[PDB]
Design a protein around this ligand. Structure first.
Ligand SMILES: Nc1nc2c(ncn2[C@@H]2O[C@H](COP(=O)(O)OP(=O)(O)O)[C@@H](O)[C@H]2O)c(=O)[nH]1
Length: 173
């Protein structure tokens, strides 16, 4: 009720990486495109308005009108598909070009439950994240692991940047 901020989030990344299932897990706490949820972050209630690009990756969603105004984005790859990890630089560039240069991004390496099929290590991706000014978590939309955490860390960093005067909360974000 007493929600104090409203942030537009994107969920972006290659087709097949689990973007739809991540949102269903976050909102409904089940495995299984728009969603909204209010979370409490350090005593502030934040409404998230989540634009999930599932099924619209090959080009429909990759536009100024869709990205515009997003304060945060979950950039999703699949730990079992190296190509989806190689595509991150493309998606990072998209997000910065089409939303803004200061969009807050969290890298999500999804399907961590598929340990036997892993093609991208945690350590390599963590190093990449550190190099590209990115938060990073591995997630499983299947089990729920780190799903809530991904949205919450993204929201917390946005609030931190509002506090630091790096982000204008009435601007894009
Ligand atoms: N085992 C496992 N499978 C997943 C996970 N997330 C998504 N999937 C599967 O990956 C495929 C694509 O997921 P989906 O959410 O439709 O991908 P999208 O195209 O990015 O929306 C489907 O077969 C899902 O069942 C996960 O965390 N673990």
């Amino acid at each position: 009720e007493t929600y104090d901020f409203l942030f537009k989030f994107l969920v972006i990344g290659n087709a097949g990486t689990g973007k739809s299932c991540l949102l269903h897990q976050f909102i409904e706490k089940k495995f299984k495109e728009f969603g909204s949820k209010i979370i409490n972050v350090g005593g502030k209630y934040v409404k998230l308005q989540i634009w999930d690009t599932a099924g619209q990756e090959r080009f429909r969603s990759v536009t100024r009108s869709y990205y515009r105004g997003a304060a945060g984005a979950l950039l999703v790859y699949d730990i079992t598909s190296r190509e989806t990890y190689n595509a991150l630089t493309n998606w990072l560039t998209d997000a910065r070009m089409l939303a803004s240069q200061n969009i807050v991004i969290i890298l999500c390496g999804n399907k961590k439950d598929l340990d036997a099929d892993r093609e991208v290590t945690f350590l390599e991706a963590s190093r990449f994240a550190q190099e590209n000014e990115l938060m990073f978590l591995e997630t499983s939309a299947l089990t729920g692991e780190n799903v809530e955490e991904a949205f919450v860390q993204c929201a917390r960093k946005i609030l931190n940047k509002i506090e630091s005067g790096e982000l204008d909360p009435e601007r894009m974000g």
